[PDB]
Design a protein around this nucleic acid. Structure first.
Ligand code: PAR
Ligand code: PCY
Ligand code: MG
Ligand code: MG
Ligand code: MG
Ligand code: MG
Ligand code: MG
Ligand code: MG
Ligand code: MG
Ligand code: MG
Ligand code: MG
Ligand code: MG
Ligand code: MG
Ligand code: MG
Ligand code: MG
Ligand code: MG
Ligand code: MG
Ligand code: MG
Ligand code: MG
Ligand code: MG
Ligand code: MG
Ligand code: MG
Ligand code: MG
Ligand code: MG
Ligand code: MG
Ligand code: MG
Ligand code: MG
Ligand code: MG
Ligand code: MG
Ligand code: MG
Lengths: 99, 138, 125, 208, 150
RNA sequence: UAAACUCCUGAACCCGGGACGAAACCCCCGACGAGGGGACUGACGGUACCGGGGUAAUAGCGCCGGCCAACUCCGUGCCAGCAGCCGCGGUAAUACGGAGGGCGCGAGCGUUACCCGGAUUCACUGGGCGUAAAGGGCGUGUAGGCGGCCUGGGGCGUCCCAUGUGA
RNA sequence: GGAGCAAACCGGAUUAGAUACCCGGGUAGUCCACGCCCUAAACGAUGCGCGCUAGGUCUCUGGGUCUCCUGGGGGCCGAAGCUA
């Protein structure tokens, strides 16, 4: 099975590409507590159809660029700008950790 | 805000029993009721019942002890010697049926929430299921 | 700590500190005596303890204890070092091994002979 | 090699009478009927309350010295019994009693385990027809333990097989006395033996 | 009459004008090897008298130990002050695996097959008192049933 | 009982036989296939193993204050030395050196070095923070973690069955 | 800005000595504004929030049918329990 993941488009700045943040969760190997973790995937959108906020599925794919190995299978639901806020703030916090 | 109502319930019991109270109320929840049912069936409590306290749903819970004892300190033996959450908000604990534990060589229970309802270890093992390991009582 | 805290931080494995650079752990290291001095102990002991400052192959120049009844070590002696502090002598973390290279083993030693490195005697044997 | 050295001398020390000489360690002396105290200069002086260790040590030295086996071989047997199913105490004894050198002695062909050892070593013994010179060999049940036809004429085998005229043999063994051959019908239960040894102490000794 | 094992004897000392002044303590277990043990702690100016005193105290202090074939109905942890004792059932052929203190006690109660562990303060006195509580606190399928009726 | 000594066996060593590992490739019949027949081939090795003869024929190392199984006499006098930790030695040392004796292992026994253990002494199982080490000087609040009661939908966690994989 | 107090410092005592304790002076400083510093036995040496488990007694501050009852806060003694 070509791996199908699902997450949230958090960038459309590139041409024919969307960035998709994808959550995965699981027990911690020692401490057992279920923990979330995530990862961004660059996904191929040949028709710049998908935009900021969309939940999409993402599918394992024949390579399209360096580090672009996924295509956008389908829209799951639109909207979710809340989740994009989540990401964008987490991102600007970074500048408040320097010297 | 009360993070774990089940831990709350359990602890209300732990506490009331340690001073030989005849009963405790505990704010009512369907889930809570199901755990009590087991508790009652297994003879840890006398029984329980729905009630309103300031017109709000509780579960009065009739506790149960040994007989009076002999020498100095004639306080009754306790029926609930031990009662203790396992799975908790901070850290859920889930088990397959092959790893449901034997509580005090079976002289003790483990209550256990499954997709075939809340069950003791034995009920659930025979029913061939596991799930969230709620608490162990001996 | 909370579980969330263990998840964030975890516990720290404790690194054990070597009592002994005979450099690379290597069970014995060969050296050349430099000063064969006598040193007094400390604490609650009194004696004239026999000691070699040793230049090693391992690079280190270190001080070693010469165990046994009495010895035959002088200023260019060439000896094997083994590790084993002395405790009454500060900065003495190794012993010389007797019976090897220019440290002859202890003569007249009937008992624990294999430490001290002295061959089997031959009168009733 | 196995012990080699004074014997009815731990007959002493170990308190109990051990049967390591067979004929004499049996008759006004395992040296023990004359001097029932430890060897050496201190032997007869108020023994000190023994440490839990001393006790457990002694019991295992007892059991081991009885079978004449070495610490390494004894130890491996114990570890083997521990892995195996069932009361690990008896099992060990099961295994210890399955040694050909012992069976041969249990069967009367030799008067001592030590002497049984020499018989087995020097080819005088045969398991199931085929001959076998290993003291450690595991006799399993069913096995016939004969004497070597070539070896039969020997004074020693004769006497011992003749003094087995009257004699009765353990419940796990049988013995055609004339054909100079016995059998190993099954492995002995703890109850089958009357050893002066509480193995619960031995298991305990191998716990730290 | 029971067996009487002595676990711990020690000499304590109090101070007085011109010199120290010694007392002796003795811990003694007594038991029949069949479900009765008693722990006794007895002090006195001479060792003899303290041991004797302790045995006496030990007999006035006995316990139901529900054996079940040389071992116990279930596992128990007991903390006594800072000393913790764990007590685990074992099949036969295990032995009493335990440190000097809880073993003597478990021996004379006729436990033959049991797994233990001292956690905490490894103080003999307190380890012994925990072992007693631990035995003291053992129930069986029988008594538990009886407790849970109504 | 150890020795001496009395019977008994017979490692070493000497004599004799003597391997399995090798049936194929190949050749012949059949058809150059199936099937059948035939011949060669051994480094290890004159070894393993079998048979006859046959000699009482190696014992060492560590330890004996407590932890820890094993104690006495001499020598020595805070010296010489021992020492894993506690600590021994200053004229009666079971702690040093030797003797006798004893304990433990045994073609080994000790030493040093390194890993895990004990160490629930990084604690998930399984620890702590008033005075022992440990509550941030106090707040505000971001990310994050956690979340009261009732009903319905989805089934991501979770649980179950079957199956592939885990050489 | 500066009354009083007072590191340093200038003197007087005391003392074996006295770079101190005692006495007499005395600058910074202590005071104000603005800007820094960011420490402490910054202590309850006790993180915050929530629920649960006898009472008695004194106190500050609300409400009630004001002998007594019922909130919020500060103390003391103490059930169960915990603690080395
Ligand atoms: N150490 C005292 C304090 O602990 C406080 O928090 C702790 C305590 O409130 C409480 O710990 C309790 C303890 O109160 C009470 N004495 C009994 C219990 N044994 C402890 O519990 C803790 O330890 C046990 C294991 O011992 C765990 O199984 C349990 O899950 C854990 N809560 O729960 C917290 C768990 O550590 C605060 N951190 C702080 O006030 C201070 O550190
Ligand atoms: C107090 C007395 O009798 C007495 C006698 C002789 C000398 C002194 N000297 C005293 C001396 N005046 C001292 N001052 C003092 O004691 N006061 C009560 C003011 C001074 C600080 O040096 C002292 C403390 O040293 C002293 O008390 C002695 O100590 C006091
Ligand atoms: Mg309550
Ligand atoms: Mg599975
Ligand atoms: Mg000294
Ligand atoms: Mg003697
Ligand atoms: Mg504690
Ligand atoms: Mg400790
Ligand atoms: Mg002999
Ligand atoms: Mg002959
Ligand atoms: Mg000893
Ligand atoms: Mg020595
Ligand atoms: Mg002397
Ligand atoms: Mg020593
Ligand atoms: Mg000596
Ligand atoms: Mg070998
Ligand atoms: Mg650990
Ligand atoms: Mg923990
Ligand atoms: Mg700690
Ligand atoms: Mg502190
Ligand atoms: Mg604070
Ligand atoms: Mg806040
Ligand atoms: Mg938040
Ligand atoms: Mg919820
Ligand atoms: Mg699912
Ligand atoms: Mg002055
Ligand atoms: Mg002044
Ligand atoms: Mg002034
Ligand atoms: Mg307070
Ligand atoms: Mg109040």
């Amino acid at each position: 099975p070509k791996k199908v993941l699902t997450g949230v488009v958090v960038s459309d700045k590139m041409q024919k590409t969307v960035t998709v943040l994808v959550e995965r969760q699981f027990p911690h190997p020692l401490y057992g507590k279920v923990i979330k973790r995530s990862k961004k995937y660059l996904a191929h959108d040949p028709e710049e159809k998908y935009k900021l906020g969309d939940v999409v599925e993402i599918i394992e794919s024949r390579p399209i660029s360096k580090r672009k190995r996924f295509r956008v299978l389908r829209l799951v639901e639109s909207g979710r700008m809340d989740l994009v806020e989540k990401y964008l703030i987490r991102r600007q916090n970074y500048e408040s950790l320097s010297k | 805000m009360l993070t774990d109502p089940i831990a709350d319930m359990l602890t209300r019991i732990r506490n009331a029993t340690r001073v030989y109270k005849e009963s405790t109320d505990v704010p009512a929840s369907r889930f809570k009721e199901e755990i009590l049912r087991i508790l009652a069936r297994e003879g840890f409590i006398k029984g329980y019942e729905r009630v309103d306290v300031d017109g709000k749903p509780y579960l009065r819970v009739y506790l149960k002890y040994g007989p009076r004892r002999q020498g100095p300190d004639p306080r009754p033996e306790q029926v609930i010697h031990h009662i203790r959450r396992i799975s908790k908000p901070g850290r859920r604990v889930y088990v397959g049926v092959k790893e449901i534990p034997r509580v005090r060589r079976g002289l003790g229970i483990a209550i256990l929430s499954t997709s075939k309802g809340v069950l003791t270890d034995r009920e659930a093992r025979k029913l061939g299921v596991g799930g969230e390991l709620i608490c162990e009582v001996w | 700590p909370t579980i969330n805290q263990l998840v964030r931080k975890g516990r720290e494995k404790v690194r054990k500190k070597s009592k002994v650079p005979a450099l690379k752990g290597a069970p014995f290291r060969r050296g050349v005596c430099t000063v064969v001095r006598t040193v007094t102990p400390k604490k609650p002991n009194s004696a004239l303890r026999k000691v070699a400052k040793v230049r090693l192959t391992s690079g280190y120049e270190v001080t070693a204890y010469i165990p046994g009844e009495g010895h035959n070590l002088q200023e260019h002696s060439v000896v094997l070092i083994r590790g084993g502090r002395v405790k009454d002598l500060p900065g003495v973390r190794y012993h010389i091994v007797r019976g090897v290279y220019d440290a002859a083993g202890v003569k007249d030693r009937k008992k624990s002979r294999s430490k001290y490195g002295t061959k089997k005697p031959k009168e009733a044997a | 090699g196995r012990y080699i050295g004074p014997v009815c001398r731990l007959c002493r020390r170990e308190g109990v009478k051990l049967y390591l000489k067979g004929e004499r360690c049996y008759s006004p002396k395992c040296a023990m009927e004359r001097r029932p105290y430890p060897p050496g200069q201190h032997g007869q002086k108020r023994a000190r309350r023994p440490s839990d260790y001393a006790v457990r040590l002694r019991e295992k030295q007892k059991l081991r010295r009885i079978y004449g086996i070495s610490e390494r071989q004894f130890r491996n047997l114990f570890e083997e019994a521990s892995k195996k199913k069932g009361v690990t105490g008896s099992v060990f004894l099961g295994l210890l009693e399955s040694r050909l050198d012992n069976v041969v002695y249990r069967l009367g062909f030799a008067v001592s385990r030590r002497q049984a050892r020499q018989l087995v070593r020097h080819g005088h013994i045969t398991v199931n027809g085929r001959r076998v010179d290993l003291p450690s060999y595991r006799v399993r049940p069913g096995d016939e333990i004969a004497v070597a036809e070539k070896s039969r004429n020997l004074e020693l085998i004769r006497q011992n097989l003749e003094a087995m005229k009257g004699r009765k043999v353990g419940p796990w063994l049988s013995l055609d006395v004339e054909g100079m051959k016995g059998k190993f019908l099954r492995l002995p239960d703890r109850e089958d033996l009357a050893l002066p040894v509480n193995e619960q102490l031995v298991i305990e000794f191998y716990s730290r | 009459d029971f067996e009487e094992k002595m676990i711990l004897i020690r000499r304590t000392a109090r101070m007085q004008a011109g010199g120290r002044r010694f007392r002796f303590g003795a811990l003694v277990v007594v038991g029949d090897r069949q479900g009765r043990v008693g722990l006794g702690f007895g002090k006195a100016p001479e060792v003899p008298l303290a041991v004797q005193k302790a045995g006496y105290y030990a007999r006035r202090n006995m316990v139901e130990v529900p054996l079940q074939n040389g071992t116990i109905p279930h596992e128990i942890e007991v903390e006594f002050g800072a000393s913790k004792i764990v007590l685990k059932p074992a099949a036969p052929g295990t032995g009493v695996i335990a440190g000097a203190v809880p073993r003597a006690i478990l021996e004379l109660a006729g436990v033959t097959d049991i797994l233990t562990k001292e956690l905490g303060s490894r103080n003999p006195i307190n380890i012994a008192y925990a072992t007693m509580e631990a035995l003291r606190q053992l129930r069986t399928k029988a008594d538990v049933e009886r407790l849970r009726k109504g």
